[PDB]
CSV table of C-alpha atoms and ligand atoms in Angstrom, one decimal:
chain,number,residue,atom,x,y,z
A,1,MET,CA,-32.2,26.0,32.9
A,2,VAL,CA,-33.0,24.2,29.6
A,3,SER,CA,-34.5,26.3,26.7
A,4,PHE,CA,-36.3,25.5,23.5
A,5,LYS,CA,-35.6,28.7,21.3
A,6,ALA,CA,-32.7,28.0,18.9
A,7,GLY,CA,-32.6,24.4,17.8
A,8,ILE,CA,-31.8,22.2,14.9
A,9,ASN,CA,-33.4,19.1,13.5
A,10,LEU,CA,-31.9,15.6,13.4
A,11,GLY,CA,-33.8,14.3,10.4
A,12,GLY,CA,-32.6,11.3,8.5
A,13,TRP,CA,-31.5,9.4,11.6
A,14,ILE,CA,-34.4,7.4,13.0
A,15,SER,CA,-36.9,9.1,10.7
A,16,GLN,CA,-36.7,9.1,6.9
A,17,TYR,CA,-33.8,6.7,7.1
A,18,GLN,CA,-32.5,5.4,3.8
A,19,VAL,CA,-32.5,1.8,4.9
A,20,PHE,CA,-33.5,0.3,8.2
A,21,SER,CA,-30.0,-0.7,9.5
A,22,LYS,CA,-28.1,-0.8,12.8
A,23,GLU,CA,-25.0,0.5,11.1
A,24,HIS,CA,-26.9,3.6,10.0
A,25,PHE,CA,-28.6,4.1,13.4
A,26,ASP,CA,-25.3,3.7,15.3
A,27,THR,CA,-23.2,6.0,13.1
A,28,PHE,CA,-25.5,8.8,11.6
A,29,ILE,CA,-25.8,10.6,14.9
A,30,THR,CA,-23.3,10.0,17.7
A,31,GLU,CA,-22.4,12.0,20.8
A,32,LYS,CA,-19.9,14.0,18.8
A,33,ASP,CA,-22.7,15.6,16.8
A,34,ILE,CA,-24.7,16.7,19.9
A,35,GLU,CA,-21.4,18.1,21.2
A,36,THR,CA,-20.9,20.0,18.0
A,37,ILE,CA,-24.4,21.4,18.1
A,38,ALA,CA,-23.9,22.3,21.8
A,39,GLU,CA,-20.6,24.1,21.1
A,40,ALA,CA,-22.4,26.0,18.3
A,41,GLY,CA,-24.8,27.6,20.8
A,42,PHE,CA,-28.1,25.8,20.0
A,43,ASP,CA,-30.2,25.1,23.1
A,44,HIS,CA,-32.0,22.0,21.9
A,45,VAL,CA,-32.5,19.5,19.1
A,46,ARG,CA,-35.7,18.2,17.5
A,47,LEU,CA,-35.7,14.5,17.0
A,48,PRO,CA,-38.2,13.1,14.5
A,49,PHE,CA,-38.7,9.3,14.7
A,50,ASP,CA,-40.8,7.0,12.5
A,51,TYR,CA,-42.9,4.5,14.4
A,52,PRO,CA,-41.4,1.3,12.9
A,53,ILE,CA,-38.1,1.8,14.9
A,54,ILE,CA,-40.3,1.4,18.0
A,55,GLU,CA,-43.2,-0.8,16.9
A,56,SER,CA,-43.8,-3.4,14.2
A,57,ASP,CA,-47.2,-3.7,12.5
A,58,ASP,CA,-47.3,-7.4,13.3
A,59,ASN,CA,-46.9,-7.7,17.1
A,60,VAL,CA,-48.5,-4.4,17.7
A,61,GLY,CA,-47.9,-3.5,21.3
A,62,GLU,CA,-44.4,-4.9,21.8
A,63,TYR,CA,-42.0,-2.0,21.9
A,64,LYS,CA,-38.6,-2.6,20.5
A,65,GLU,CA,-35.9,-1.8,23.2
A,66,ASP,CA,-33.4,-1.7,20.3
A,67,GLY,CA,-35.2,1.3,18.8
A,68,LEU,CA,-35.9,3.0,22.1
A,69,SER,CA,-32.2,2.8,22.9
A,70,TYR,CA,-31.5,5.5,20.3
A,71,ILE,CA,-33.9,7.9,21.8
A,72,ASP,CA,-32.6,7.1,25.3
A,73,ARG,CA,-29.0,7.7,24.4
A,74,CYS,CA,-29.9,11.0,22.6
A,75,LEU,CA,-31.6,12.1,25.8
A,76,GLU,CA,-28.4,11.3,27.6
A,77,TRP,CA,-26.2,13.2,25.2
A,78,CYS,CA,-28.5,16.2,25.5
A,79,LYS,CA,-28.6,16.0,29.3
A,80,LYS,CA,-24.8,15.9,29.3
A,81,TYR,CA,-24.6,19.1,27.1
A,82,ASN,CA,-27.6,20.8,28.7
A,83,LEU,CA,-29.7,20.7,25.5
A,84,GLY,CA,-33.4,20.2,25.3
A,85,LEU,CA,-34.9,17.5,23.1
A,86,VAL,CA,-38.3,17.7,21.3
A,87,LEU,CA,-39.3,14.1,20.5
A,88,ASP,CA,-41.4,14.2,17.4
A,89,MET,CA,-43.4,11.4,15.9
A,90,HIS,CA,-42.9,12.0,12.1
A,91,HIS,CA,-44.6,8.9,10.8
A,92,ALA,CA,-47.6,7.6,12.8
A,93,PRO,CA,-49.3,4.2,12.4
A,94,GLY,CA,-51.2,4.3,9.2
A,95,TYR,CA,-50.2,7.9,8.7
A,96,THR,CA,-53.2,6.5,1.7
A,97,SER,CA,-53.2,7.3,5.4
A,98,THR,CA,-55.5,5.1,7.3
A,99,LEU,CA,-54.8,6.6,10.7
A,100,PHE,CA,-58.0,8.7,10.8
A,101,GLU,CA,-60.1,5.9,9.3
A,102,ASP,CA,-58.9,3.0,11.3
A,103,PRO,CA,-59.5,3.1,15.1
A,104,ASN,CA,-56.8,0.4,15.5
A,105,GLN,CA,-54.2,2.7,14.1
A,106,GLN,CA,-55.6,5.4,16.4
A,107,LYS,CA,-55.3,3.0,19.4
A,108,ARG,CA,-51.7,2.2,18.5
A,109,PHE,CA,-50.9,5.9,18.1
A,110,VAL,CA,-52.2,6.7,21.6
A,111,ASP,CA,-50.5,3.7,23.1
A,112,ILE,CA,-47.1,4.6,21.8
A,113,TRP,CA,-47.4,8.0,23.4
A,114,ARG,CA,-48.7,6.5,26.7
A,115,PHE,CA,-45.7,4.2,26.7
A,116,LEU,CA,-43.2,7.1,26.0
A,117,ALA,CA,-44.8,9.3,28.7
A,118,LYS,CA,-44.3,6.5,31.2
A,119,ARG,CA,-40.8,5.7,30.0
A,120,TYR,CA,-39.5,9.3,30.5
A,121,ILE,CA,-41.6,10.2,33.6
A,122,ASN,CA,-38.6,11.2,35.6
A,123,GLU,CA,-37.1,13.5,33.0
A,124,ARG,CA,-38.7,16.8,33.7
A,125,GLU,CA,-36.4,19.4,32.0
A,126,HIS,CA,-34.8,18.1,28.9
A,127,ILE,CA,-37.6,16.5,26.9
A,128,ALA,CA,-40.8,17.6,25.2
A,129,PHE,CA,-43.2,15.6,23.1
A,130,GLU,CA,-44.5,16.6,19.6
A,131,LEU,CA,-47.5,14.3,18.9
A,132,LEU,CA,-47.8,14.3,15.1
A,133,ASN,CA,-45.6,15.9,12.5
A,134,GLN,CA,-47.8,17.3,9.7
A,135,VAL,CA,-51.4,16.3,9.2
A,136,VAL,CA,-53.1,16.5,5.8
A,137,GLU,CA,-56.8,16.4,6.0
A,138,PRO,CA,-59.9,17.9,4.4
A,139,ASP,CA,-60.5,19.6,7.7
A,140,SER,CA,-59.3,19.4,11.3
A,141,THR,CA,-62.3,17.5,12.7
A,142,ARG,CA,-60.7,14.1,12.9
A,143,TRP,CA,-57.2,15.1,14.0
A,144,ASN,CA,-58.8,17.2,16.7
A,145,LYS,CA,-60.6,14.2,18.0
A,146,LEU,CA,-57.4,12.0,17.9
A,147,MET,CA,-55.4,14.9,19.5
A,148,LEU,CA,-57.8,15.4,22.4
A,149,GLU,CA,-57.7,11.7,23.2
A,150,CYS,CA,-53.9,11.6,23.0
A,151,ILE,CA,-53.5,14.7,25.3
A,152,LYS,CA,-56.0,13.1,27.7
A,153,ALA,CA,-54.1,9.8,27.7
A,154,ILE,CA,-50.8,11.5,28.4
A,155,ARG,CA,-52.2,13.7,31.1
A,156,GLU,CA,-53.3,10.6,33.1
A,157,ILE,CA,-49.6,9.6,33.4
A,158,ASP,CA,-47.8,13.0,33.3
A,159,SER,CA,-49.7,16.3,34.1
A,160,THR,CA,-46.9,18.7,33.3
A,161,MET,CA,-45.2,17.2,30.3
A,162,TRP,CA,-44.8,19.9,27.6
A,163,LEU,CA,-46.7,18.8,24.5
A,164,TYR,CA,-46.1,20.4,21.0
A,165,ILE,CA,-49.3,20.4,18.9
A,166,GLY,CA,-49.5,21.3,15.3
A,167,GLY,CA,-52.3,21.8,12.9
A,168,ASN,CA,-53.7,20.6,9.6
A,169,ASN,CA,-52.0,20.7,6.2
A,170,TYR,CA,-48.4,20.2,7.4
A,171,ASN,CA,-48.6,22.3,10.5
A,172,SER,CA,-49.5,25.4,8.5
A,173,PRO,CA,-49.5,28.6,10.5
A,174,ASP,CA,-53.1,29.4,9.4
A,175,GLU,CA,-54.5,26.1,10.5
A,176,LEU,CA,-53.7,26.7,14.1
A,177,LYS,CA,-57.0,28.5,14.3
A,178,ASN,CA,-58.8,25.3,13.4
A,179,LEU,CA,-57.4,23.2,16.4
A,180,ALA,CA,-59.8,22.3,19.3
A,181,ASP,CA,-59.5,24.3,22.4
A,182,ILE,CA,-57.1,22.5,24.7
A,183,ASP,CA,-57.5,23.8,28.2
A,184,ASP,CA,-54.0,23.0,29.3
A,185,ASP,CA,-51.1,25.1,30.5
A,186,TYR,CA,-48.4,22.8,29.1
A,187,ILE,CA,-49.0,23.2,25.4
A,188,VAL,CA,-46.8,24.9,22.7
A,189,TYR,CA,-48.3,25.5,19.3
A,190,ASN,CA,-46.2,24.3,16.3
A,191,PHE,CA,-46.1,25.5,12.7
A,192,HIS,CA,-43.6,24.8,9.9
A,193,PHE,CA,-42.4,27.6,7.6
A,194,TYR,CA,-41.0,27.1,4.1
A,195,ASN,CA,-42.3,30.3,2.3
A,196,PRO,CA,-41.7,31.1,-0.6
A,197,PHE,CA,-41.9,27.4,-1.6
A,198,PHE,CA,-40.3,27.8,-5.0
A,199,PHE,CA,-37.3,29.5,-3.4
A,200,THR,CA,-36.9,27.2,-0.3
A,201,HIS,CA,-37.6,24.1,-2.5
A,202,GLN,CA,-36.2,25.2,-5.8
A,203,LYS,CA,-35.3,22.1,-7.9
A,204,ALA,CA,-36.5,19.8,-5.0
A,205,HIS,CA,-36.2,16.4,-6.6
A,206,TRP,CA,-39.2,15.1,-4.6
A,207,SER,CA,-41.5,18.0,-5.6
A,208,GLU,CA,-43.1,17.5,-9.0
A,209,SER,CA,-44.2,21.1,-9.4
A,210,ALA,CA,-40.8,22.3,-8.3
A,211,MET,CA,-39.0,19.8,-10.5
A,212,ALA,CA,-41.2,20.7,-13.5
A,213,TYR,CA,-40.6,24.5,-12.9
A,214,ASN,CA,-36.9,23.7,-12.6
A,215,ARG,CA,-35.8,27.2,-11.9
A,216,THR,CA,-33.1,28.8,-9.8
A,217,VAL,CA,-34.5,31.7,-7.6
A,218,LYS,CA,-32.7,34.3,-5.6
A,219,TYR,CA,-33.7,36.1,-2.4
A,220,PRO,CA,-34.6,38.9,-2.2
A,221,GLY,CA,-35.9,38.7,-5.7
A,222,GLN,CA,-38.9,37.5,-7.6
A,223,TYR,CA,-40.2,34.5,-9.5
A,224,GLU,CA,-39.3,34.6,-13.2
A,225,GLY,CA,-40.8,32.9,-16.2
A,226,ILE,CA,-44.0,31.8,-14.4
A,227,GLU,CA,-46.1,32.9,-17.4
A,228,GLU,CA,-43.9,31.1,-19.9
A,229,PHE,CA,-43.8,28.1,-17.6
A,230,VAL,CA,-47.6,27.8,-17.3
A,231,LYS,CA,-48.0,28.3,-21.1
A,232,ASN,CA,-45.9,25.1,-21.6
A,233,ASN,CA,-47.3,23.2,-18.7
A,234,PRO,CA,-51.1,24.0,-18.3
A,235,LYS,CA,-51.2,21.4,-15.5
A,236,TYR,CA,-49.5,23.9,-13.2
A,237,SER,CA,-51.9,26.7,-14.2
A,238,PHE,CA,-52.5,27.4,-10.5
A,239,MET,CA,-48.9,28.8,-10.4
A,240,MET,CA,-50.1,31.7,-12.4
A,241,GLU,CA,-51.0,33.5,-9.2
A,242,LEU,CA,-47.3,33.5,-8.3
A,243,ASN,CA,-46.4,35.3,-11.5
A,244,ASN,CA,-43.8,38.0,-10.8
A,245,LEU,CA,-44.2,37.6,-7.1
A,246,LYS,CA,-41.6,39.7,-5.2
A,247,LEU,CA,-39.7,37.7,-2.6
A,248,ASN,CA,-38.7,39.8,0.4
A,249,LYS,CA,-38.9,40.2,4.2
A,250,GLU,CA,-42.4,41.8,4.1
A,251,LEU,CA,-43.5,38.7,2.1
A,252,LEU,CA,-42.2,36.5,5.0
A,253,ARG,CA,-43.9,38.7,7.6
A,254,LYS,CA,-47.2,38.4,5.7
A,255,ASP,CA,-47.1,34.6,5.8
A,256,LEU,CA,-46.3,34.5,9.5
A,257,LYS,CA,-49.2,36.8,10.3
A,258,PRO,CA,-51.8,33.9,10.8
A,259,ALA,CA,-49.7,32.5,13.7
A,260,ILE,CA,-49.2,35.9,15.3
A,261,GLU,CA,-52.9,36.6,15.2
A,262,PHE,CA,-53.7,33.2,16.7
A,263,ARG,CA,-51.4,33.9,19.6
A,264,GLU,CA,-53.1,37.3,20.2
A,265,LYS,CA,-56.3,35.4,21.0
A,266,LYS,CA,-54.9,32.3,22.7
A,267,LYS,CA,-52.1,34.1,24.5
A,268,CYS,CA,-50.1,30.9,24.0
A,269,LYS,CA,-46.5,29.8,23.2
A,270,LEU,CA,-45.6,29.3,19.6
A,271,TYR,CA,-42.8,27.2,18.0
A,272,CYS,CA,-41.7,26.7,14.4
A,273,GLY,CA,-40.4,23.2,14.3
A,274,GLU,CA,-39.1,23.3,10.8
A,275,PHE,CA,-37.9,26.0,8.5
A,276,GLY,CA,-35.1,26.0,5.9
A,277,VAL,CA,-33.7,26.4,2.4
A,278,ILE,CA,-32.6,23.6,0.2
A,279,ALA,CA,-28.8,23.4,0.2
A,280,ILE,CA,-28.5,23.9,-3.6
A,281,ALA,CA,-29.8,27.5,-3.5
A,282,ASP,CA,-27.1,30.1,-3.9
A,283,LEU,CA,-25.3,30.7,-0.6
A,284,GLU,CA,-26.0,34.4,-0.4
A,285,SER,CA,-29.7,33.9,-0.9
A,286,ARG,CA,-29.8,31.0,1.5
A,287,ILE,CA,-28.1,33.0,4.3
A,288,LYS,CA,-30.3,36.1,3.6
A,289,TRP,CA,-33.5,34.1,3.9
A,290,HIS,CA,-32.5,32.6,7.3
A,291,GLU,CA,-31.3,35.9,8.6
A,292,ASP,CA,-34.6,37.6,7.6
A,293,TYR,CA,-36.7,34.7,9.0
A,294,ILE,CA,-34.7,34.4,12.3
A,295,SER,CA,-35.1,38.1,12.6
A,296,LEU,CA,-38.9,37.8,12.6
A,297,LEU,CA,-38.9,34.9,15.1
A,298,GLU,CA,-36.7,37.0,17.3
A,299,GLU,CA,-39.1,40.0,16.9
A,300,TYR,CA,-42.1,38.0,17.8
A,301,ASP,CA,-40.4,35.8,20.4
A,302,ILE,CA,-41.0,32.5,18.7
A,303,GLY,CA,-38.6,29.6,19.2
A,304,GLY,CA,-37.8,27.0,16.5
A,305,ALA,CA,-35.7,24.5,14.9
A,306,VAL,CA,-34.0,24.7,11.5
A,307,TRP,CA,-34.2,21.8,9.0
A,308,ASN,CA,-31.7,20.1,8.8
A,309,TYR,CA,-28.5,19.2,10.7
A,310,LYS,CA,-26.9,17.0,8.1
A,311,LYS,CA,-28.0,15.4,4.8
A,312,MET,CA,-31.7,15.6,3.8
A,313,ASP,CA,-30.9,18.2,1.1
A,314,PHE,CA,-31.2,21.0,3.6
A,315,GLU,CA,-27.8,20.5,5.4
A,316,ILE,CA,-26.4,23.1,7.7
A,317,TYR,CA,-23.3,20.9,8.4
A,318,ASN,CA,-21.1,18.8,6.2
A,319,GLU,CA,-20.7,15.1,7.1
A,320,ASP,CA,-17.3,16.0,8.8
A,321,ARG,CA,-19.2,18.2,11.4
A,322,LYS,CA,-18.1,21.4,9.9
A,323,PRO,CA,-20.7,24.0,9.1
A,324,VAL,CA,-21.5,24.8,5.4
A,325,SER,CA,-21.3,28.5,6.4
A,326,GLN,CA,-20.2,29.8,9.8
A,327,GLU,CA,-22.2,33.0,9.5
A,328,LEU,CA,-25.3,30.8,8.8
A,329,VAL,CA,-24.7,28.8,12.1
A,330,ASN,CA,-24.3,32.1,14.0
A,331,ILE,CA,-27.5,33.4,12.7
A,332,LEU,CA,-29.3,30.1,13.6
A,333,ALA,CA,-28.0,29.8,17.2
A,334,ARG,CA,-29.4,33.2,18.0
B,1,LIG,O1,-39.3,12.5,2.2
B,1,LIG,C1,-39.6,13.6,1.4
B,1,LIG,C2,-38.4,14.7,1.6
B,1,LIG,O2,-38.6,15.3,2.9
B,1,LIG,C3,-37.7,16.5,3.1
B,1,LIG,O3,-37.9,17.0,4.4
B,1,LIG,C4,-39.2,17.6,4.6
B,1,LIG,C5,-39.7,17.4,6.1
B,1,LIG,O4,-39.5,16.1,6.6
B,1,LIG,C6,-41.2,17.7,6.0
B,1,LIG,O5,-41.7,17.6,7.4
B,1,LIG,C7,-41.5,19.2,5.3
B,1,LIG,O6,-42.8,19.3,4.8
B,1,LIG,O7,-40.6,19.5,4.2
B,1,LIG,C8,-39.2,19.1,4.4
B,1,LIG,C9,-38.4,19.6,3.2
B,1,LIG,O8,-39.1,19.3,2.0
B,1,LIG,C10,-36.2,16.2,2.9
B,1,LIG,O9,-35.5,17.4,3.0
B,1,LIG,C11,-36.0,15.4,1.6
B,1,LIG,O10,-34.6,15.0,1.5
B,1,LIG,C12,-37.0,14.1,1.5
B,1,LIG,O11,-36.8,13.4,0.3
């Protein structure tokens, strides 16, 4: 029995890689990592991949066996340690995202999934597919169209492959209600969870509003100096609504509600593919958030995967495969 309830992400390997290099690809994640994860009690890993390791924009259609080898070996390592694997396309063709504008990008997208479905057709227990990681559109109309075509295409080849489908605006829990009705029994609905953003992403070097705010935040606790911050930076005036907001478990439960309600109606399976706290947050707060959040997922029977195994500013493990906090790993392995 393979399960997909308590996992961890493998970001930074064949997705969001620093430089496209074999050295990186061959050493960032090796079997020793999958073993560590397995010994820790996680039941699966989420593997984001960016299209270019599989297909080049020039000779569109020729799939690189050198890139695929990494996914293959990871599947082997997982099979060996009885872990599940959620293969996730993090960066699609064209997705300044032309994917929903250019039918050619759409064709390539579907073809890559058709290829993978065929390639792993004999693996029935250890792998699941996550079509597109985070969409950011005015509305769900175009993604719904692309998604339905992709599901259709995959079903022609594999009728029982579990597919993980997320909604608009970074797989937001309240955008699930805007997805097209997929009449299919092998679908799991995905949503990401990083609430409260200024706590989970405090001082995030890649977040302009978070870098501008440049404020340490505790949890439980509350946002401080928002009023004084907006005064100085009228550009982030929208942040005024977060003024003195109290961060606590009931706050987290309120943000999760949209997903819970969607499931009431669809009677479907939910999954939170990404959730976490930037590693520079004080340890006590960081542990407390995960404990509170994991607690809610347990309560509502939702599986998920914490961001991130190593590196990517959200590390759970040091580069020497030792956890940053053992109590944290225990909470996360459920
Ligand atoms: O590349 C930007 C930034 O991404 C960070 O990870 C993301 C994750 O991939 C994304 O799906 C979600 O919306 O947010 C997380 C956390 O911001 C990663 O942690 C950074 O190192 C990276 O620079």
